Amino acid sequence: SGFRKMAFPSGKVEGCMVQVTCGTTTLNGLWLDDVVYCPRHVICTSEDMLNPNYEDLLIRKSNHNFLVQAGNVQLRVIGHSMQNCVLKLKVDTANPKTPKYKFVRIQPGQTFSVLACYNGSPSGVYQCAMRPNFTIKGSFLNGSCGSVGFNIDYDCVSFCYMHHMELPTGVHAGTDLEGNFYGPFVDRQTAQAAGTDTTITVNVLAWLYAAVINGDRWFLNRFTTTLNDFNLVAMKYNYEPLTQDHVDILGPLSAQTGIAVLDMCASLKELLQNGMNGRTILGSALLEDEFTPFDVVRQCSGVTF
Amino acid sequence: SGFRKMAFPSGKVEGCMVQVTCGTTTLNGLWLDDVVYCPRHVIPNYEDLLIRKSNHNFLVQAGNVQLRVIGHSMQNCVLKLKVDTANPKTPKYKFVRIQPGQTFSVLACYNGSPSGVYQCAMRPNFTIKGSFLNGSCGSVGFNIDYDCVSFCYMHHMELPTGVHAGTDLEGNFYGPFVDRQTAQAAGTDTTITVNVLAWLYAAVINGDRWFLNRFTTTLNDFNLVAMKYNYEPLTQDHVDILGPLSAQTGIAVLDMCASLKELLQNGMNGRTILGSALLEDEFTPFDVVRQCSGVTF
Ligand SMILES: CCNS(=O)(=O)N1Cc2ccc(Cl)cc2[C@H](C(=O)Nc2cncc3ccccc23)C1
Ligand SMILES: CCNS(=O)(=O)N1Cc2ccc(Cl)cc2[C@H](C(=O)Nc2cncc3ccccc23)C1
Ligand SMILES: [Cl-]
Numbered sequence: 001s002g003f004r005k006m007a008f009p010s011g012k013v014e015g016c017m018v019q020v021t022c023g024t025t026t027l028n029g030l031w032l033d034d035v036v037y038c039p040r041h042v043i044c045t046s047e048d049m050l051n052p053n054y055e056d057l058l059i060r061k062s063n064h065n066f067l068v069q070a071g072n073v074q075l076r077v078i079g080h081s082m083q084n085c086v087l088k089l090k091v092d093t094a095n096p097k098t099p100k101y102k103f104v105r106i107q108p109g110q111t112f113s114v115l116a117c118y119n120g121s122p123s124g125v126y127q128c129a130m131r132p133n134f135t136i137k138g139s140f141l142n143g144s145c146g147s148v149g150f151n152i153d154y155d156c157v158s159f160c161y162m163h164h165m166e167l168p169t170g171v172h173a174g175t176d177l178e179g180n181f182y183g184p185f186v187d188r189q190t191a192q193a194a195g196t197d198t199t200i201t202v203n204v205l206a207w208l209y210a211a212v213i214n215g216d217r218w219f220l221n222r223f224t225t226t227l228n229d230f231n232l233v234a235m236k237y238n239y240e241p242l243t244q245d246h247v248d249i250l251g252p253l254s255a256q257t258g259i260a261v262l263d264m265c266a267s268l269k270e271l272l273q274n275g276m277n278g279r280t281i282l283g284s285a286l287l288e289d290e291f292t293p294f295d296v297v298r299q300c301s302g303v304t305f
Numbered sequence: 306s307g308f309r310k311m312a313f314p315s316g317k318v319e320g321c322m323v324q325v326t327c328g329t330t331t332l333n334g335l336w337l338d339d340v341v342y343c344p345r346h347v348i349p350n351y352e353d354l355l356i357r358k359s360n361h362n363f364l365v366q367a368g369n370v371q372l373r374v375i376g377h378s379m380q381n382c383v384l385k386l387k388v389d390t391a392n393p394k395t396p397k398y399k400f401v402r403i404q405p406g407q408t409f410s411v412l413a414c415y416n417g418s419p420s421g422v423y424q425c426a427m428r429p430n431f432t433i434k435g436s437f438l439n440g441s442c443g444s445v446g447f448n449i450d451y452d453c454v455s456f457c458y459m460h461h462m463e464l465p466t467g468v469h470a471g472t473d474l475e476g477n478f479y480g481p482f483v484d485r486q487t488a489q490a491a492g493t494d495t496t497i498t499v500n501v502l503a504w505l506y507a508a509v510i511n512g513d514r515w516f517l518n519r520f521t522t523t524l525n526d527f528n529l530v531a532m533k534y535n536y537e538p539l540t541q542d543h544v545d546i547l548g549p550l551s552a553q554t555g556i557a558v559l560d561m562c563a564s565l566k567e568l569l570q571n572g573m574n575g576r577t578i579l580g581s582a583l584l585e586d587e588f589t590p591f592d593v594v595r596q597c598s599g600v601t602f
Pocket of ligand 2: 438462463484
């Protein structure tokens with residue numbers, strides 16, 4: 001019993017965190033095998049950030065301009081290349097702590113653990129989701145750039161996010177591990193604002209199934225809905241459209257609890273209309289959208305209370 | 306910017322988790338040096354049950370390696386299994402007993418394999434609102450100060466309300482609980498007042514200031530109001546501990562208490578604080594200072 005925002009154990013990622021320094025800038029890098037991956041903005045000054053020409057800034061650098069520190073050991077850089085918005089620093093030592101890993105690009109609504117780091121040293125781990133507007137609501141201070149997001153399903157680490165910047169609203173933007181940004185963002189100090197965000201509907205539904213599994217049904221009703229009518233109501237509360245893929249994905253939770261997806265959709269419609277009336281659902285007074293259907297199946301029991 | 310329920314990096318603890326099997330029961334153990342610590346319920350008259358066991362009855366698995374048990378002893382509600390191999394991954398550590406209101410990270414494990422990490426607090430009723438399934442017994446709670454892991458909790462059981470009970474690493478339970486199948490229940494819980502105030506300061510640091518007001522209160526008047534809303538009494542020690550956050554934001558502790566009093570009597574009126582519609586009490590003053598400063602390990 002219980003339901004917590006749970007992150008993956010971070011040990012496999014901690015053994016990959018390094019500090020990368022280029023001139024006056026210091027940030028974090030991910031050391032996998034003989035390569036250190038870090039945001040390419042490490043080669044920039046604050047002035048450069050308005051309109052940086054990364055190819056022009058990088059051509060002026062040599063291997064020995066990049067200082068890489070792994071714990072108390074200085075790693076020697078023997079090569080460098082840029083791939084999209086990430087810099088790849090070839091080092092002379094392979095990381096002996098390199099786990100089994102993959103680079104995966106996630107979609108909005110997907111969750112992942114973040115190991116927040118400063119000076120190549122991990123400070124904390126938290127769970128979060130890629131918002132529909134492609135930003136993440138993280139907890140990051142100056143020096144956190146290069147911190148990574150990941151999932152560890154079956155001993156293999158899937159790296160999905162590298163932190164690059166904070167937007168004016170306090171939310172965060174970054175790239176996959178191939179350097180492609182999530183969202184219409186650029187690693188440039190320009191007028192960039194997060195788009196209007198929406199609630200991840202399939203995740204709220206997963207979390208309502210988690211409350212049913214843990215023994216709570218106060219929010220259910222005798223009604224059902226069509227998918228179209230549900231979406232017409234959902235859009236009015238800034239909820240993402242629910243697709244047939246989402247309905248298919250919620251199939252296992254529907255069979256475990258005995259509650260049809262469109263019947264849970266009817267209950268969600270009623271919660272949006274009425275609020276919670278002093279009640280909570282899994283210790284929350286708001287509808288929670290940072291647990292995927294997969295996270296609910298992973299954390300919750302296979303036996304409904 | 307941002308404010309998340311953040312746990313300590315769990316790597317130093319992951320390298321200590323093992324699987325302990327005794328007969329039909331399988332649970333988790335903590336392998337430090339040549340000793341494996343686990344709940345004694347893995348084997349009730351515990352001395353009578355233990356005397357009938359030999360070292361070879363305890364099967365200990367560390368990854369894919371079987372550890373050999375060469376001795377066993379009981380300390381309160383914790384079983385200590387002497388093994389023939391010292392853990393090469395043993396970190397610098399201490400066993401510490403925490404107080405209600407203090408927070409810690411939990412590395413939830415099943416079959417000696419870590420599955421998740423979350424942050425939680427020791428409630429005033431000595432229970433923890435954790436997330437544990439069958440097989441999680443022996444999962445541990447900890448904090449990190451510099452490079453030293455301070456182990457403060459070992460999971461033993463789930464109470465009828467779905468909350469959890471356990472011991473420090475010396476086997477002493479937190480709360481009036483016993484390790485056995487009998488009628489047990491969590492007492493009426495209260496809100497950790499000093500933690501709610503710390504979270505209000507974290508909100509002000511993050512730009513959420515709508516709840517601030519021109520008013521102040523006495524400590525006595527605040528405690529009379531707080532006792533009515535099932536909030537723990539605020540002591541002068543709590544006021545002293547909130548000193549740094551008060552100087553950083555310019556809001557006196559009793560000035561923030563007047564904000565808390567108004568939130569308790571009138572509610573949030575459709576508003577949120579750090580994305581929450583409830584007053585959050587699982588961040589200590591030290592957790593707020595650490596998350597809004599970037600302390601590393
Ligand atoms: C308010 C952030 N603007 S800044 O400090 O002037 N700035 C400009 C900038 C522009 C573009 C790119 Cl790719 C990076 C960056 C860096 C940047 O976003 N870093 C930071 C990242 N995450 C959290 C932070 C939390 C406080 C401060 C910096 C943080 C540095
Ligand atoms: C609901 C508890 N009843 S039980 O399963 O028969 N039971 C009785 C018991 C009595 C005394 C002690 Cl010290 C331990 C325990 C164990 C116990 O609390 N384990 C469990 C721990 N955490 C989460 C669980 C989530 C579902 C089930 C068990 C869980 C086992
Ligand atoms: Cl995905």
